[PDB]
Amino acid sequence: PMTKVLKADDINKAISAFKDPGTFDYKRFFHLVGLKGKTDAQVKEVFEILDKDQSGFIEEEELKGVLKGFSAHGRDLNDTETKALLAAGDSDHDGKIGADEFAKMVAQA
Ligand SMILES: [Ca+2]
Ligand SMILES: [Ca+2]
Numbered sequence: 001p002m003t004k005v006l007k008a009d010d011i012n013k014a015i016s017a018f019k020d021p022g023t024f025d026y027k028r029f030f031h032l033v034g035l036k037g038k039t040d041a042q043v044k045e046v047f048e049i050l051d052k053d054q055s056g057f058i059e060e061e062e063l064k065g066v067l068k069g070f071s072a073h074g075r076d077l078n079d080t081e082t083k084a085l086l087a088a089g090d091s092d093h094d095g096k097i098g099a100d101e102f103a104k105m106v107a108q109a
Contacts, residue, residue, distance in 0.1 A: 004045060005035075005045050005046055007034055021075065026089075027109040040103060064076050064082050
């Protein structure tokens with residue numbers, strides 16, 4: 001559950017900001033949810049909840065469901081929003097987000 005790391009109200013604030021399709025911005029999202037300023041081990045705890053099938057990577061299918069990892073009231077990301085997350089975070093160009101790529105995205109937000 002994300003409340004092991006993040007405040008319940010910050011999660012709801014961030015879900016509200018992105019309730020409508022096409023609005024996602026990863027930098028604003030990590031600022032609103034309070035993931036900035038957390039330790040490397042807390043960020044990797046969040047990474048592990050988002051990696052639903054426990055493959056060690058957030059594949060595109062799971063990137064689409066990133067907001068639902070924080071709240072069941074969230075919506076799915078559309079394909080333009082999912083591609084923008086790979087454009088910004090997929091450093092080694094293998095088409096998915098690894099743990100240190102995810103930690104980097106949080107660091108640069
Ligand atoms: Ca996975
Ligand atoms: Ca990658």
